[PDB]
Every structure is written in structure tokens, then in C-alpha cells.
């Protein structure tokens, strides 16, 4: 609607905001909210023992779930910038941005790899 | 779902209304497996750009709908 981009009013993340970041964050929140439910639906679907009609219904429900319920849709962005390439998980930062931070001394224990 | 167990890939469609009265089903699914329950129903499967009219084959029963709506144009070379 007009007052918000997505259906649910989620907060903005602190520090660097970006449109893509906003999109990702919301998606992550919705996944967190509807994680157990999705799992339960998946279980009901992939069951040889249960009634077939019920499993079909569960599968249909899973199919009909939105873009923001999907775990696979989540992509690890850089947190300092808003890039989504070469994003290292141990400091949620992009390649160049990580290097910049590392050389400054922002990182907790990172330093030049001399051998 | 490809694997035989847990198959097929089912999607919600306006199937029963099409069966009652010949109204083509405009699918934007392209990953829904064709079933025996819709052979002889008119589908209008999405191609990216334009919806493609297909009367579902009796042999198409195993395949996906997107397999019958070819997205890219047939390649050629301008011999200049």
C-alpha cells in the first residue's frame, strides 16, 4: 500500500539503510516469524504414512505462501555497505568494505596475512 | 517435486470452471506438472512476454507447462 512497501510494518535496521537491504531484512523477519509453520507444512507434505489428501493440502498451502516466507530467498548483504557479492559471514561485510575495516582496526582480531 | 516420491508438482488453477465451460486457463506457473485431470483443457501459458495458447496434449501428461512455451526467439545471423 502507500504507507509501507511490504504488508507488515517492520523496523528499519540501524546504520546503513538501502532499498535492497530493506527488502532483505523484511524477508528475514517474515521467515523468522513463520519458520515453525513452514517446517510443519513441509513435514505434512513429505509423509508416506499420513493421508494423501492432507499432504496434498499442505503442499498447496506451501505453494501459496508468499515471497517473504521463503528461506531460500534470503541473501547475505554487506551490513556496512549494501553490496551482495563476496559477503564474508564472519564479519557481515563485502570484500572491499571488509578490507577497509580490517586495515583501520574495526575488526576484533583481523590483521595483515603475512605468513 | 521431481523425485517420484512426493510427486507431482501441483499448483492451484481455475480447472473445474474450465472443465464445465471452455474458458482457457491463463497460467503464469510454467513449473506445474501436467496431470491426467487436465487433458483437453485449453491453457494460455506465460512466455515472459505474451501468453501462449495450448490445448494440453494427451502425451504431455508427464511434462511441465513451461516446456511448451519457448521463451527465447529462434536465433539468426544478419549476414552483413
Amino acid at each position: 500500500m502507500g504507507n509501507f512497501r511490504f504488508p507488515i510494518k517492520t523496523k528499519l535496521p540501524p546504520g546503513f539503510i538501502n532499498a535492497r537491504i530493506l527488502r532483505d531484512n523484511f524477508k528475514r523477519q517474515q521467515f523468522k516469524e513463520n519458520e515453525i509453520l513452514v517446517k510443519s507444512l513441509k513435514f505434512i507434505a513429505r509423509n508416506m504414512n499420513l493421508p494423501t489428501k492432507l499432504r496434498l493440502e499442505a503442499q498447496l498451502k506451501l505453494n501459496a505462501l508468499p515471497n517473504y516466507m521463503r528461506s531460500t530467498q534470503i541473501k547475505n548483504r554487506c551490513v556496512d555497505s549494501g553490496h551482495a557479492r563476496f559477503v564474508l559471514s564472519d564479519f557481515r561485510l563485502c570484500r572491499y568494505q571488509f578490507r577497509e575495516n580490517a586495515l583501520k582496526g574495526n575488526l576484533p582480531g583481523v590483521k595483515k596475512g603475512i605468513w | 517435486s521431481r523425485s517420484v516420491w512426493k510427486g507431482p508438482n501441483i499448483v492451484p488453477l481455475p480447472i473445474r470452471e474450465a472443465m464445465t465451460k471452455g474458458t482457457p486457463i491463463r497460467t503464469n506457473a510454467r513449473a506445474a506438472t501436467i496431470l491426467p485431470q487436465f487433458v483437453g483443457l485449453k491453457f494460455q501459458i506465460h512466455n515472459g512476454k505474451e501468453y501462449v495458447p495450448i490445448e494440453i496434449s494427451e502425451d504431455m501428461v508427464g511434462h511441465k507447462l513451461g516446456e511448451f512455451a519457448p521463451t527465447r526467439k529462434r536465433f539468426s545471423y544478419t549476414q552483413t
Partner: peptide, 28 residues
Amino acid sequence: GSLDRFNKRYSSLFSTVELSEENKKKTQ
């Protein structure tokens, strides 16, 4: 015999009731 093949390898599930379950005519 594609339909026949389909019937063979989706036999345990038994695939009408199934049609009724998977036919919501709102979206088109």
C-alpha cells in the same frame, strides 16, 4: 503412453476428490 507412464509412477499416491482439492478458481 505418457499418461500410462504417469499412472504407473504416481500409483502409490492414487493422484473427483483430488480435482476438488486442487482447483481454486479465484486466481486466473
